[PDB]
Design a protein around this ligand. Structure first.
Ligand SMILES: CCCCCCCCCCCCCCCCCC(=O)OCC(COC(=O)CCCCCCCCCCCCCCCCC)OC(=O)CCCCCCCCCCCCCCCCC
Ligand SMILES: CCCCCCCCCCCCCCCCCC(=O)OCC(COC(=O)CCCCCCCCCCCCCCCCC)OC(=O)CCCCCCCCCCCCCCCCC
Ligand code: HEA
Ligand code: HEA
Ligand SMILES: CCCCC/C=C\C/C=C\C/C=C\C/C=C\CCCC(=O)O[C@H](COC(=O)CCCCCCCCCCCCCCCCC)COP(=O)(O)OCCN
Ligand SMILES: CCCCCC/C=C\CCCCCCCCCC(=O)O[C@H](COC(=O)CCCCCCCCCCCCCCC)COP(=O)(O)OC[C@@H](O)CO
Ligand SMILES: CCCCCC/C=C\CCCCCCCCCC(=O)O[C@H](COC(=O)CCCCCCCCCCCCCCC)COP(=O)(O)OC[C@@H](O)CO
Ligand SMILES: CCCCCC/C=C\CCCCCCCCCC(=O)O[C@H](COC(=O)CCCCCCCCCCCCCCC)COP(=O)(O)OC[C@@H](O)CO
Ligand SMILES: CCCCCC/C=C\CCCCCCCCCC(=O)O[C@H](COC(=O)CCCCCCCCCCCCCCC)COP(=O)(O)OC[C@@H](O)CO
Ligand SMILES: CCCCCCCCCCO[C@@H]1O[C@H](CO)[C@@H](O[C@H]2O[C@H](CO)[C@@H](O)[C@H](O)[C@H]2O)[C@H](O)[C@H]1O
Ligand SMILES: CCCCCCCCCCO[C@@H]1O[C@H](CO)[C@@H](O[C@H]2O[C@H](CO)[C@@H](O)[C@H](O)[C@H]2O)[C@H](O)[C@H]1O
Ligand SMILES: C[C@H](CCC(=O)O)[C@H]1CC[C@H]2[C@@H]3[C@H](O)C[C@@H]4C[C@H](O)CC[C@]4(C)[C@H]3C[C@H](O)[C@]12C
Ligand SMILES: C[C@H](CCC(=O)O)[C@H]1CC[C@H]2[C@@H]3[C@H](O)C[C@@H]4C[C@H](O)CC[C@]4(C)[C@H]3C[C@H](O)[C@]12C
Ligand code: CUA
Ligand SMILES: [Cu+2]
Ligand SMILES: [Mg+2]
Ligand code: NA
Ligand code: NA
Ligand SMILES: [Zn+2]
Lengths: 43, 94, 227, 58, 84, 79, 46, 259, 514
């Protein structure tokens, strides 16, 4: 496929941000629930 | 009684249904209901491809019973050829 | 029972299970061969700069790759069906035992002569004696005579269960209102373990089966000792 | 009865930009708003009932 | 496999009206007679509380929970028998 | 007094994995026979074969429920 | 009539990549989080 | 514009209100069965009827009043209705399967016989036979209506369709009466289960079919159909023959063979 | 205009986009459920301390992946986007009914959520067998909400099947016969016939379960003369067709992808590929009782079902070898989509072969209801459907969006996923052969090592899913607009550019007959 150059290029710094934000959005909520499992099982 | 009172299509069809009905009476196919029959496809006798605009996609079934259809935009101007079999197509606007 | 890092079937305890092991060896060889041939041919297709992109004719090559799979399937099906019909053929048992599934334990009935019955529950982990197996022991094992053809009848008094003993090649669903039969023959004395094999709620994982195979004279003493 | 189809054909072909479900006139709008209000309100009510039913009720 | 009738030549409305009034509706009339001769109530049978009938695993979501939707007191006994 | 009974033999009427009807049939056979043998000249010992077979094959709760229903007058099989 | 073309044939905006990143994070993060919170809910119920 | 013959439909709210009506009906049934309340169910039934009414109203507007049903569009609708009827046949097949499964192998709880001990079936030569003659007769009368329409005869189309609808209503009232008189109920084991669920879904389809024929009757009164273009009538007739054939299978299987 | 466009749609591309969005979101839900499963099993003992909840998680995982991730993405998303473009049609036959097939799914999913929030959930298995799923062992609303969830999904797909069959038969150019339509269009047509015929039977079966639970019917209750095994027959009469429904659009996308990146104008052996799909669809209706080999069926029935099941390997093998023969002689473009398709061919083959093992009812006695079956279908279904979906998404994302992906990132994502799914599921063969049952929250100690490895594998695939989200973001963030693609002469869906205009083929293609 051929493509025009990026209209709004995403620098490596910008990628590291988007990746970290993406990963955190999956990991933090699940992490919170799993960390507190014993606080749940005792209620 | 065996009487009447049911409208006919000629009396009551409207909109696109009526346009298709009227064109069929005149033996024309503006709404692309029929498959066109090929010419010999030579440079002298190209397949004539109607369009309301200046380009139309052609699919070419190069030999009878080919399952692969060859697709390309045909533009107004000099006839173009199928990139598979070379048969000629000429756009005829509108 | 299974042991750590096991890759294949539990050792066969009955003749039918030995048959399955040999049949599985046969079929797995074919599975490995076909899987490996496909992988190889993928790599073969992908490793040349030579090209041929015009239309290819398919008729000749499609004879090969319908006839040869058809032959292979027949070579699987013939031993497969032979074993199937062996399992089914008349075995004339000397003993019938019933088992009834419940949520969540098994009960057993030996009603050929005496009207013996009892319940069989998993030993909780906290009560296991040292060296006993987590999730597998029961309080009351299914005592049975070795080297004898036994008719097991399986049903349920509530939801579906399934009575299984892998090393004897046994798995028979326990269905309320239905009496399913299977045949059991152990070549060896010992303890043979299995687990409920149709999801039956909360404690599906925790209603195991333990057979205790002993010589006939000991089976009779045990029977005798129950009256 | 007499055949009034032509007058309905004229009505429903009027170039007023209206989508077909509103082209009959003000009654269409009423019926649409009734329908949509019942659907969206019932959906909100059904979510309320989920909330209620999700917790033991003493 | 076409009955003992026999009348085509170009099927049409006249033929299907002829079938409607000459065969179909007479049949309905005759079955209606048949039916409204064999009507009249039969002796209802002794009640026996068979466990495969009058099933109740959950109360019905209407009435007192124990009556079927088109319960007929004359011929439908409850699990405990016919009603008063 | 022909016995030496060990367990119920294979019955070509019931050759498949579902043995429900084999239990049911012998339960009926036994109880039909035991009723017949209350006529003049009858002893239930003739019914013994059916009795051993159904006792061998039938779950205890099935026998117990059927017995209860025969006593209630709600048994649905014909005896 | 409707807008056409890249970034215009979708029900979410890509005009700003950081606003987009928030949207996509809420979108996929909400679906991924939901089973963990339902499990929590059932464990907490009693 | 376009130079094909197909129908680009105006953006419509009725798919969304139909889907929400489905949520309300099913959550409404749940609330009825488990939380002693008909509220949600009543809303859902109301929004479902509103959705169907406006959606099929719009189809009439698109076709009779705006002319969008070219022959290609009509051909598509023919396929769609045939495929819909096929899916409905398979739905009934599941209930017939349940019936034959239960009745060919009656369990000990039944008495090991069919009909079960304690079940006293309807006489298939009484009202069930009358119902059979009723639906068969309405298949003849709807065919008379069809030919009258094709032949341009308004009065006889309306008479024949009226007779067809009258027979469908007669079937429904006969079946309602038989349900009330039946000495067995849906709770009478698998006999009652198969009888009432299978004939009950069929009765529902009779009411649906009759309603469809009534729609056609009023559209015919309003001169919507031409002698050549009348696919709503053809679809309702196909659906009606389907309802008649399901009945014949029910009659032979459940009422007659199963008695 | 936003509501008119996205809630009142009558446009095949926009409705296809809604389905892809819905399916992706469902994929996150189903992934989270799969990780909870593997967390429970990742060491011996109990994690959730509530095995009913575990069973609810397993049940929901399956329904979400099958009904809300795979079928909406394949049929609703790729089908709606691609089928009308591949036949030059201006939309679907019933463009407005199409929107209702979409909008039935958020309520269906809501009913599944409701099932898991009320009472103790439906911890039944996605099979929902009675009596476990009946009103005594699963009292309360959860199972009924699950049944209603399936009714709505079923209506959605039955109407979508009506739409696709009608579209494909009726809306091709007048010169194009069925044997000139692309294989993906064939695959959707056949999938739609399977849905049309199978889903009504499921509907009948779960409706009988509904009435056993709420109206005192006894279809499945021996006390009334019913039979639990009848439910199984009705369920699996739908469920075996269902597994071919889940893979067939995948086979269609794989044919197009392998053809494209081999630089070919056409797949090898087109009519064989049509034959093979029709044969698989037909045989898929006469094998269902291989899900019932331990319920007590007569030996001759077990023999028939073994034999009929194995026959499906013949047409399937024609497709596998034909994909290989399409690669043969190609100018191979090692794109990320090609990687997905190559991983598909191999992993689907492994999974199909363990299916042939299971077809042998004698061996299935020992393998039924064990992790061997779980391993079989996570190869052939889970990896099969996911790899075809990923290959299709990477290949057609630039068509749907107008933007290119970063190919290096996409290849990395493939690599991570390939490791993760094989680490997760390959050891489950050993667990099955050695007798570990499925549907268990904990296991005898002997089984610890492979459960530990399998759970570690599940986290690697989690890392892949997260990375996939980032990669999609990066593409929309950078906005590299497509100019051209190669091979448009044999890939009509690209010829109106990227993304195509809202209305395409307003003037239909010209195809003559000669
Ligand atoms: C054409 C180009 C696109 C092609 C590619 C497609 C995109 C693929 C990647 C996708 C990459 C883009 C991601 C875009 C983020 C969108 C914002 C403020 C907004 C916040 C959003 C959060 C809200 C999220 C919704 C909830 C109208 C749209 C409908 C979408 C489907 C609804 C999904 C859930 C509904 C079920 C509810 C029941 C919950 C039931 C739970 C059961 C447990
Ligand atoms: C991408 C990597 C991700 C990381 C995760 C893992 C991925 C899988 C790769 C793993 C590479 C796989 C190579 C063949 C594996 C066979 C292992 C075995 O010894 O199997 C033994 C049998 C039962 O055997 C027995 O009853 C006796 C066992 C002991 C034999 C005697 C020797 C004692 C010591 C044994 C030491 C080990 C022997 C192994 C010998 C090794 C020979 C090769 O178990 C079984 O049937 C399990 C088979 C499941 C059925 C699927 C077969 C199709 C796969 C063919 C291509 C691989 C796809 C991989 C899937 C994709 C892989 C690319
Ligand atoms: C994508 C979905 C999918 C597909 C396509 C398949 C394909 C097959 N499946 Fe599988 N299956 C499932 C999804 C699928 N399955 C699911 C979900 C279950 C479990 C449901 C549950 O219980 O929850 C299951 C369960 C299941 C069982 C029941 C096991 C049990 O519960 O005990 C069986 C039994 O026969 C089986 C067999 C097969 C066979 C023979 C095929 C065949 O169609 C495979 C054919 C393919 C090949 C053979 C490979 C390619 C062929 C060649 C390279 C040719 C040469 C090969 C030979 C000569 C052998 N499957
Ligand atoms: C399309 C179907 C599909 C898919 C994609 C998956 C994906 C996964 N499945 Fe699932 N699974 C089922 C269908 C599927 N499964 C079914 C039908 C059952 C049986 C339910 C029952 O017993 O009732 C089941 C059961 C099942 C079990 C057995 C539970 C038990 O017996 O107790 C396990 C255990 O490890 C498991 C794990 C996983 C994992 C780790 C993944 C994935 O994380 C692998 C990586 C894939 C993705 C991340 C997808 C991403 C795509 C877009 C986001 N699955
Ligand atoms: C007059 C001719 C017949 C017309 C139809 C009559 C009403 C039926 C309405 C719909 C029928 C469809 C569902 C069938 C369900 C059971 C109804 C069976 C027919 C019926 O009406 O059965 C009655 C019981 O109704 C009952 O329980 C109460 C029934 C009311 C609640 C039904 C709730 C269940 C609905 C489930 C729908 C699922 C649909 C799924 C479609 C999915 C498509 C993919 C029988 O009455 P009885 O007093 O037991 O015995 C008579 C004794 N004198
Ligand atoms: C200490 C932390 C280590 C992090 C390890 C991450 C591991 C691998 C990162 C490298 C992967 C780069 C993949 C893209 C290469 C683009 C090539 C291309 O072809 O782009 C051109 C044009 C060039 C673009 C390069 C962009 C590189 C982006 C880095 C992303 C962030 C990763 C770190 C996470 C946060 C700490 C078109
Ligand atoms: C092409 C014909 C091939 C043969 C297969 C179908 C034949 C069914 C005959 C059953 C007759 C008794 C045979 C007994 C065999 C085992 C016992 C008994 C149960 O029987 C039962 O209900 C069986 C119930 C039916 C099971 C299979 C049903 C499939 C139904 C849907 C098929 C589509 C039908 C389309 C109709 C328009 C136990
Ligand atoms: C007491 C009330 C109970 C309520 C429950 C459900 C109720 C009733 C539903 C009854 C169905 C009514 C359907 C009316 C459809 C009217 C619109 C119509 O008929 O539209 C026709 C097109 O057909 C078309 O779309 C064909 C459209 C097909 C409709 C198919 C309907 C079957 C519906 C089944 C729904 C339930 C399913 C079963 C549940 C288990 C319009 O084309 P023509 O007729 O050619 O006209 C054009 C000419 O005038 C030109 O000269
Ligand atoms: C437990 C309770 C469960 C409840 C579930 C409830 C589910 C759904 C709520 C349903 C609301 C339905 C609203 C009316 C839908 C009418 C659809 C229709 O009639 O669709 C037509 C096409 O389908 C055709 O013909 C042929 C098909 C006609 C289909 C009619 C609707 C049937 C809906 C139920 C189907 C169930 C499947 C039954 C088998 C098991 C027209 O297609 P359009 O794209 O609109 O227009 C095209 C234009 O060219 C017309 O001028
Ligand atoms: C199956 C998918 C799961 C993948 C695993 C997720 C990987 C880890 C992601 C991080 O999750 C965070 O972990 C913290 C612990 O590191 C938690 O803080 C908790 O622990 C801290 C340290 O003890 C306290 O400071 C906090 O207040 C307390 O909430 C926090 O809640 C949680 O978001
Ligand atoms: C789509 C999700 C919907 C799932 C619905 C589950 C069924 C809910 C019906 C419950 O409604 C509640 O019931 C209580 C007891 O009758 C009332 O007191 C209360 O006022 C009512 O609101
Ligand atoms: C006749 C038909 C269509 C040919 C055409 O019109 O192009 C072709 C298409 C696929 C062919 C089949 C497939 O190639 C698979 C089988 C291959 C064997 O060599 C013959 C039987 C076999 C079952 C074939 C019979 C027949 O030639 C088929 C069915
Ligand atoms: C009013 C209308 C006249 C036809 C026309 O308007 O030209 C006539 C023609 C056929 C008539 C209908 C048909 O004869 C069938 C029905 C006859 C019943 O006895 C009364 C209602 C019934 C439904 C009639 C109502 C009305 O008189 C109709 C509808
Ligand atoms: Cu008992 Cu599982
Ligand atoms: Cu299957
Ligand atoms: Mg099982
Ligand atoms: Na007609
Ligand atoms: Na665990
Ligand atoms: Zn050409």
């Amino acid at each position: 496929i051929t493509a025009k150059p990026a209209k709004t290029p995403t620098s490596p710094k910008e990628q590291a941000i988007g990746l970290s934000v993406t990963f955190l959005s999956f990991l933090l909520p699940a992490g919170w629930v799993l960390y507190h499992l014993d606080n749940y099982k005792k209620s | 009684a065996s009487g009447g009172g049911v409208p006919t299509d000629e009396e009551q069809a409207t909109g696109l249904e009526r346009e298709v009905m009227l064109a069929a009476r005149k033996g024309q196919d503006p709404y692309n209901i029929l498959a066109p029959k090929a010419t010999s496809g030579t440079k002298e006798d190209p397949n004539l491809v109607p369009s309301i605009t200046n380009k139309r996609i052609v699919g070419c079934i190069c030999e009878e019973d080919n399952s692969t259809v060859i697709w390309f935009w045909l533009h107004k101007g000099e006839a173009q050829r199928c990139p598979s079999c070379g048969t000629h197509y000429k756009l005829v606007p509108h | 029972m299974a042991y750590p890092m096991q890759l294949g079937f539990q050792d066969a305890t009955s003749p039918i299970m030995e048959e399955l092991l040999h049949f599985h060896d046969h079929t797995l060889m074919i599975v490995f061969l076909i899987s490996s041939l496909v992988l190889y041919i993928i790599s073969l297709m992908l490793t040349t700069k030579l090209t041929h992109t015009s239309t290819m004719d398919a008729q000749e090559v499609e004879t090969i790759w319908t006839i040869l799979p058809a032959i292979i399937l027949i070579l699987i099906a013939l031993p497969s069906l032979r074993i199937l019909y062996m399992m089914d053929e008349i075995n004339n048992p000397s003993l019938t035992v019933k088992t009834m599934g419940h949520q969540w334990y098994w009960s057993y009935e030996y009603t050929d002569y005496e009207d013996l019955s009892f319940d069989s529950y998993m030993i909780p982990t906290s009560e296991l004696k040292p060296g006993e197996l987590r999730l597998l022991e029961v309080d009351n094992r299914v005592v049975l005579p070795m080297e004898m053809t036994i008719r097991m009848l399986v049903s349920s008094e509530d939801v579906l269960h399934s009575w299984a003993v892998p090393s004897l090649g046994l798995k028979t669903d326990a269905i309320p209102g239905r009496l399913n039969q299977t045949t059991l023959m152990s070549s060896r004395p010992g303890l043979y373990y299995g687990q409920c094999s149709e999801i039956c709620g909360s404690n599906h994982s925790f209603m195991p089966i333990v057979l205790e195979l002993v010589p006939l004279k000991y089976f009779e003493k045990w029977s005798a000792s129950m009256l | 009865f007499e055949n009034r189809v032509a007058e309905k054909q004229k009505l429903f072909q009027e170039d007023n930009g209206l989508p077909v479900h509103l082209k009959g006139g003000a009654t269409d709008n009423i019926l649409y708003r009734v329908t949509m209000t019942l659907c969206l309100g019932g959906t909100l009510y059904s979510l309320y009932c989920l909330g209620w039913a999700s917790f033991p009720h003493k | 496999a076409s009955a003992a009738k026999g009348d085509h030549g170009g099927t049409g409305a006249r033929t299907w009206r002829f079938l409607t009034f000459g065969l179909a509706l007479p049949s309905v009339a005759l079955c209606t007679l048949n039916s409204w001769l064999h009507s009249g109530h039969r002796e209802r049978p002794a009640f026996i509380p068979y466990h495969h009938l009058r099933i109740r695993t959950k109360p019905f979501s209407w009435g007192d929970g124990n009556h079927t939707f088109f319960h007929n007191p004359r011929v439908n006994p409850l699990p405990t028998g016919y009603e008063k | 007094k022909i016995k030496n009974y060990q367990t119920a033999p294979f019955d070509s009427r019931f050759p498949n994995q579902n043995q429900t009807r084999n239990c049911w049939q012998n339960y009926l056979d036994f109880h039909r026979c035991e009723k017949a043998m209350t006529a003049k000249g009858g002893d239930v010992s003739v019914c013994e074969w059916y009795r051993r077979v159904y006792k061998s094959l039938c779950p205890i709760s099935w026998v117990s429920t059927w017995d209860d229903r025969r006593a209630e007058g709600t048994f649905p099989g014909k005896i | 009539h409707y807008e056409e073309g890249p970034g215009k044939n979708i029900p979410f905006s890509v005009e700003n990549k950081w606003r987009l990143l928030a949207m996509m994070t809420l979108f996929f993060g909400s679906g991924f989080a939901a089973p963990f919170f339902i499990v929590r809910h059932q464990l907490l119920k009693k | 514009h376009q130079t094909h013959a197909y129908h680009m439909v105006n953006p419509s709210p009725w798919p969304l209100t139909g889907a929400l009506s489905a949520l309300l009906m099913t959550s409404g049934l749940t609330m009825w069965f488990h939380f002693n309340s008909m509220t949600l169910l009543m809303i859902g039934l109301t929004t479902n009827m509103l959705t169907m009414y406006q959606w099929w109203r719009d189809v009439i507007r698109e076709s009779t009043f705006q002319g969008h049903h070219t022959p290609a569009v009509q051909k598509g609708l023919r396929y769609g209705m045939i495929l819909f009827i096929i899916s409905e046949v398979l739905f009934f097949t599941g209930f017939f399967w349940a019936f034959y499964h239960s009745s060919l192998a009656p369990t000990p709880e039944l008495g090991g016989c069919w009909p079960p001990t304690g079940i006293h079936p309807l006489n298939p030569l009484e009202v069930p036979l009358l119902n059979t003659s009723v639906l068969l007769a309405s298949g003849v009368s709807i065919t008379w209506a069809h030919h009258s329409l094709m032949e341009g005869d308004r009065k006889h189309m309306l008479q024949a369709l009226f007779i067809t609808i009258t027979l469908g209503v007669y079937f429904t009232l006969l079946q309602a009466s038989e349900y009330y008189e039946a000495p067995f109920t849906i709770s009478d084991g698998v006999y009652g289960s198969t009888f009432f669920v299978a004939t009950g879904f069929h009765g529902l389809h009779v009411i649906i079919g009759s309603t469809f024929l009534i729609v056609c009757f009023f559209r015919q009164l309003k001169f919507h159909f031409t002698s050549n273009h009348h696919f709503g009538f053809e679809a309702a007739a196909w659906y009606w023959h389907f309802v008649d054939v399901v009945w014949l299978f029910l009659y032979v299987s459940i009422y007659w063979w199963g008695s | 205009m936003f509501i008119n466009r996205w809630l009142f749609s009558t446009n095949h591309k926009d409705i296809g986009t809604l389905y892809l969005l819905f399916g992706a979101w469902a994929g996150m839900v189903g992934t989270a459920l799969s990780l909870l499963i593997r967390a429970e099993l990742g060491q011996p003992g109990t994690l959730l301390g509530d095995d009913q909840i575990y069973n609810v998680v397993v049940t929901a995982h399956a329904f979400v992946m099958i009904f809300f991730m795979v079928m909406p993405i394949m049929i609703g998303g790729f089908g709606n986007w691609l089928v009308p473009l591949m036949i030059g049609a201006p939309d679907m036959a019933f463009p407005r009914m199409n929107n209702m097939s979409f909008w039935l799914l958020p309520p269906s999913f809501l009913l599944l959520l409701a099932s898991s929030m009320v009472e103790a959930g439906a911890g039944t298995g996605w099979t929902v067998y009675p009596p476990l799923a009946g009103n005594l062992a699963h009292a309360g609303a959860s199972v009924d909400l699950t049944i209603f969830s399936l009714h709505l999904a079923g209506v959605s797909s039955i109407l979508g099947a009506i739409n696709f069959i009608t579209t494909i038969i009726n809306m091709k150019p007048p010169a194009m016969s069925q044997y000139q339509t692309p294989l993906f269009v064939w695959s959707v047509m056949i999938t739609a016939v399977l849905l049309l015929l199978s889903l009504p039977v499921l509907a009948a079966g779960i409706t009988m379960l509904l009435t056993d639970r709420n109206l005192n019917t006894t279809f499945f209750d021996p006390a009334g003369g019913g039979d639990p095994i009848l439910y199984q027959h009705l369920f699996w009469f739908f469920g075996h067709p269902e597994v071919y429904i889940l893979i067939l659009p995948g086979f269609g996308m794989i044919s197009h992808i392998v053809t494209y990146y081999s630089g070919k104008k056409e797949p090898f052996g087109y009519m064989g590929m049509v034959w093979a799909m029709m044969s698989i669809g037909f045989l898929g209706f006469i094998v269902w009782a291989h899900h019932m080999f331990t319920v007590g069926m007569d030996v001759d029935t077990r023999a028939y079902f073994t034999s009929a099941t194995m026959i499906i390997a013949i047409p399937t093998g024609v497709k596998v070898f034909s994909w290989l023969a399409t690669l043969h002689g190609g100018n191979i473009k090692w794109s990320p989509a090609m990687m997905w398709a190559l991983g598909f061919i191999f992993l689907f083959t492994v999974g199909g072969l363990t299916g042939i093992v299971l077809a042998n009812s004698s061996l299935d006695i020992v393998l039924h209801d064990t992790y061997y079956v779980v391993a079989h279908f996570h190869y052939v279904l889970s990896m099969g459907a996911v790899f075809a979906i990923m290959g299709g998404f990477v290949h057609w994302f630039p068509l749907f969006s107008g933007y290119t992906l970063n190919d290096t990132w996409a290849k990395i994502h493939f690599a991570i996923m390939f490791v993760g799914v094989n680490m997760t599921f390959f050891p489950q063969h050993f667990l099955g052969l050695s007798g570990m049952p499925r549907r268990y929250s904990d296991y005898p100690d002997a089984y610890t090592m492979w459960n530990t490895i399998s759970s570690m594998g599940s986290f690697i695939s989690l890392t892949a899913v997260m990375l996939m989200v980032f990669i999609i973001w990066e593409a929309f963030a950078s906005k590299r607009e497509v100019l051209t693609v190669d091979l448009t002469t044999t890939n009509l869906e690209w010829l109106n550019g990227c993304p195509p205009p809202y209305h395409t083929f307003e003037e239909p293609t010209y195809v003559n007959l000669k």
